[PDB]
Structure to design on (87 residues):
């Protein structure tokens, strides 16, 4: 029987943006759309432990 | 000349703290970062 999975953490900034100043300024005009990539993968990783 | 490109600005910052009614001391966890360079 399998028990646990591989716990991963994904940055929302470095996947979408190439560390450019234009992509970060358009991200601040979006509000926050990635509010839930961090807390769901945290919420998996608590339940994997 | 032939030069590789290795990208910068990686690694996470994690904080370890108790509550605000207990203590203000914060332990800082570097995520996957060798601290001999920084």
């Amino acid at each position: 029987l399998p028990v646990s999975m591989t716990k991963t953490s994904v940055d929302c900034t470095m996947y979408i943006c190439g560390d450019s100043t234009e992509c970060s300024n358009l991200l601040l005009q979006y509000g926050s759309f990635c509010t839930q990539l961090k807390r769901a993968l945290t919420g998996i990783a608590v339940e994997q432990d | 000349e032939i030069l590789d490109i290795t990208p910068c600005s990686f690694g996470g910052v994690s904080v370890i703290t108790p509550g605000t009614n207990t203590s203000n001391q914060v332990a800082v966890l570097y995520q996957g970062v060798n601290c001999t360079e920084v």
About this structure: Chain A touches chain B at residues 9, 11, 14, 19 (CB under 8 Å). The helical segments of chain A are 12-16, 21-28, 37-48. Chain A has three helices and no strands.
